[PDB]
Design a protein around this nucleic acid. Structure first.
Ligand code: MG
Ligand code: MG
Ligand code: MG
Ligand code: MG
Ligand code: MG
Ligand code: MG
Ligand code: MG
Ligand code: MG
Ligand code: MG
Ligand code: MG
Ligand code: MG
Ligand code: MG
Ligand code: MG
Lengths: 195, 175, 139, 175
RNA sequence: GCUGCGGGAUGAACCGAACGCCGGGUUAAGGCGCCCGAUGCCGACGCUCAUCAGACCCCAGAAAAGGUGUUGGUUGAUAUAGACAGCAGGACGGUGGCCAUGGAAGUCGGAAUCCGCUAAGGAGUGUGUAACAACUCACCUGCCGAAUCAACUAGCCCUGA
């Protein structure tokens, strides 16, 4: 059904390729933590290309024409727009199925986030090559919401710690229960047939 | 040539036609690296037409045979001589390759020349292939592979492009 | 950090390739990518396989440099790699994956009913232990 | 008998070739178009058996960019005669399908049966012309694995040329 | 022109291939990250970091020249009879040689060109004085310690743009 994807440590084009392929099949995919999506190359080059993209505008009326979003979620949504056939009611329905968010929403705090191995910085890039941060680029050009998103991100990280301590306590309790006795009769079946 | 896949070594002997002006041709012999025997025969005609007064019509090929490796299970050192034609002018070259077999070493020679010097199979003319032993290698790469009790780990070994599921909770580590 | 490394005389697993699930042993490194591997008793023939094609393990052997198949077999039988390799958890992991591949429907039914019974007993004991933890922490 | 004495040996150059046409129809010079008309290659992917000769080789050297010609094996002849054996009486090509058709039309020369036909096509005897004129030009399908670039010769890793044993692999892909 | 079809995004001439209506299989030209069918092969080798990267005949952009940015290659020259770098010291006598006068006393300038001490001095590589003077270099020696230097050549990238 829903595919909640991490954005921490992913690449823009690779993640956009996998999302734009999997959204045409019907799986409702949502890319969360979009401010952490890395872009290869130099950061001066990335902001120079984005400055050229801002320079591209209609001269007779800039409103009727090129729109230039500054938020990184809308940057990734434009990246998936430029790959889906959005002028037809296949890519238009796919962009209606696609949802993108900066930070993490409260349902996606609770729901588990997936990590795509094919789009990772470590898998795809040589570790001695330069990179950038899409949230850093967005804060440098236009998107003035880094200080609020980072504060709410630290808040949900504190929430995640105070949940993970309870989860690890319950895991220690259930492994004490597994350490206890009189469960091995089924384990004679299970260890033979793939414990 | 194409040098498609791995290469193969062919011993090709060829002579002129028996003429009443001069019988018993000298029956020359070459060592042609080629993907198959037809390309070996054609490249043999090319080299012997370069060297002596020979062509395909006034001559013949007596025998064209596969040359198997004398010791495939030994990691050996091969010096390759090159007569490659660059963009401005042609140049001679001596290269060294540490590999198992002669055909594999000449295969790596073609691939490495096409990698670095942008040389096609049109321009590369293998002059000579000779196995050299240790303490004669001119190159620092083969000289630093000359190490007994050699040690190296494999840092940052990433693999399995989408053999794992495309959507997982994992965050894959290296080494 | 860097506990393992390629070596003259180290056994190594093979994950990808035509000899998957078969241990080889590195004899010497050819050039940066491929190593002449050999198998004395693991049904694999002496050849050259890539490092990304193989998988490094922890056990080492006392091979001389470029020794014979005979000396490889003698060092293998001196080091006793087969019984000591069966007596580890990693081969148990590979064996469990093979047994899951070799399951059948009746075996899955038995695993599911044992799974239900074990999870009911585990749930009751976790409930009892957290009740006892609350009863201990209440004074 | 020669390697025991330490001497080399060359076999006879074969007198029977198989010619498949590779290139198309439009954009073809008349100098090669007339040779294709005489070799009965009016469409694409049709093949004939050619009695090799100096005149025939000097025909094929004109149309080397347009054909692939080689030395067919015994089963390369046999599968083409069995599976796609079409003859002609005067007009109206008919599949062979019976020895009575060959005995009625072609069997004036003691060649009444299909064993005789395969023998006369493979071993080029004194009545090869009647058998080659009786056989319709073999319509063949496109190969399974594909072709290599169709423009350069087989020496250059291509298709349009001579390959001398690989036409057996080509006919196992196509037939 | 008189000509559809598949690629070159789009196209009169390009590359395949020529057309009655359809089913199945296969292929050329081309391609397999998404549009957009196909590499989602646990593909192989090596090169490239480009503050204007680069991306396929016609085809829609670029040269002469330059780079101690990296990768090969050729010709050479040094080095335990302790080299290249670094730190320190010496760097004279004949002779302020000779043509020159406003001056040259190695240092604007023309022709030359040897010896002694030698650990080594070039009738002197440069800075500076109008010249006289000081500094530095060729060369030598003190410490360190084993590999180092020069000129060409062509692949990517950069400047030229
Ligand atoms: Mg054409
Ligand atoms: Mg197929
Ligand atoms: Mg093709
Ligand atoms: Mg043509
Ligand atoms: Mg008109
Ligand atoms: Mg016409
Ligand atoms: Mg078209
Ligand atoms: Mg175009
Ligand atoms: Mg069809
Ligand atoms: Mg696809
Ligand atoms: Mg134009
Ligand atoms: Mg250069
Ligand atoms: Mg440029």
């Amino acid at each position: 059904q829903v595919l909640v994807l991490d954005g921490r440590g992913h690449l823009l084009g690779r993640l956009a390729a996998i999302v734009a392929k999997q959204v045409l099949l019907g799986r409702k995919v949502v890319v969360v933590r979009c401010e952490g999506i890395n872009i290869s190359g130099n950061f001066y080059r990335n902001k120079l290309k984005y400055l050229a993209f801002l320079r591209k505008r209609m001269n007779t009326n800039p409103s009727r024409g090129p729109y230039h979003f500054r938020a990184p979620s809308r940057i990734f949504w434009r990246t998936v727009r430029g790959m889906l056939p959005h002028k037809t009611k296949r890519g238009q329905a796919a962009l209606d199925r696609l949802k993108v968010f900066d930070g993490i929403p409260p349902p996606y705090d609770k729901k588990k986030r997936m990590v795509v191995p094919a789009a990772l910085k470590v898998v795809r890039l040589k570790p001695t090559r330069k990179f950038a941060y899409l949230g850093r680029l967005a804060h440098e050009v236009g998107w003035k919401y880094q200080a609020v998103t980072a504060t709410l991100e630290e808040k949900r990280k504190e929430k995640a710690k105070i949940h993970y301590r309870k989860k690890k306590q319950l895991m220690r309790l259930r492994k004490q229960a597994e350490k206890n006795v009189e469960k091995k009769i089924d384990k004679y079946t299970e260890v033979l047939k793939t414990h | 040539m194409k040098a498609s896949g791995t290469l193969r070594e062919y011993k090709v002997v060829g002579r002129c036609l028996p003429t009443p002006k001069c019988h018993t041709p000298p029956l020359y012999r070459m060592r042609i690296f080629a993907p198959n025997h037809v390309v070996a025969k054609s490249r043999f005609w090319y080299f012997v037409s370069q060297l002596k007064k020979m062509k395909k019509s006034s001559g013949e090929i007596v025998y064209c045979g596969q040359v198997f490796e004398k010791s495939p299970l030994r990691v050996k050192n091969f010096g390759i001589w090159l007569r490659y034609d660059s963009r401005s002018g042609t140049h001679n070259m001596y290269r060294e390759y540490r590999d198992l077999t002669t055909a594999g070493a000449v295969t790596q020679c073609y691939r490495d020349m096409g990698a670095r010097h942008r040389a096609r199979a049109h321009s590369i003319q293998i002059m000579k292939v000779e196995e050299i032993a240790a303490s004669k290698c001119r190159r620092p790469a083969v000289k630093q592979f000359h190490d007994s009790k050699i040690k190296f780990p494999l840092p940052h070994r990433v693999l399995r492009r989408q053999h794992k599921p495309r959507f997982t909770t994992k965050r894959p580590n290296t080494f | 950090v860097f506990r393992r490394f390629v070596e003259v005389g180290r056994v190594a697993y093979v994950s990808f390739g035509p000899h998957a699930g078969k241990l080889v042993a590195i004899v010497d490194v050819i050039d940066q990518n491929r190593a002449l591997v050999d198998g004395p008793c693991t049904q694999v023939r002496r050849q050259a396989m890539p490092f990304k094609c193989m998988q490094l393990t922890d056990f080492i052997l006392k091979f001389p440099h470029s020794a014979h198949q005979k000396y490889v077999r003698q060092a293998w039988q001196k080091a006793d790699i087969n019984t000591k390799w069966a007596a580890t958890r990693w081969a148990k992991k590979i064996e469990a994956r093979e047994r899951k591949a070799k399951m059948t429907d009746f075996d899955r039914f038995k695993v599911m009913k044992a799974k239900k019974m074990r999870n009911r007993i585990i749930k009751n004991e976790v409930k009892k232990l957290q009740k006892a933890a609350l009863l201990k922490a209440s004074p | 008998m020669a390697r025991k004495a330490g001497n080399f040996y060359v076999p006879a150059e074969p007198k029977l070739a198989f010619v498949i046409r590779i290139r198309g129809i439009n954009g073809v010079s008349p100098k090669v178009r007339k040779v294709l008309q005489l070799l009965r290659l009016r469409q694409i992917f049709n093949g004939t058996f050619v009695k090799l000769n100096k005149a025939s080789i000097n025909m094929l050297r004109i149309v080397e960019p347009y054909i692939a010609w080689g030395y067919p094996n015994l089963k390369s002849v046999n599968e083409l005669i069995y599976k796609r054996g079409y003859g002609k009486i005067n007009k109206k090509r008919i599949a062979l399908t019976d020895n009575a058709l060959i005995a009625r039309s072609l069997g004036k020369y003691g060649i009444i049966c299909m064993e005789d036909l395969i023998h006369e096509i493979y071993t080029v005897g004194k009545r090869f012309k009647e058998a080659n004129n009786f056989l319709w030009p073999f319509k063949l399908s496109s190969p399974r694995g594909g072709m290599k670039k169709k423009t350069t010769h087989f020496v250059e890793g291509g298709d349009a040329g001579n390959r001398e044993d690989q036409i057996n692999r080509l006919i196992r892909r196509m037939n």
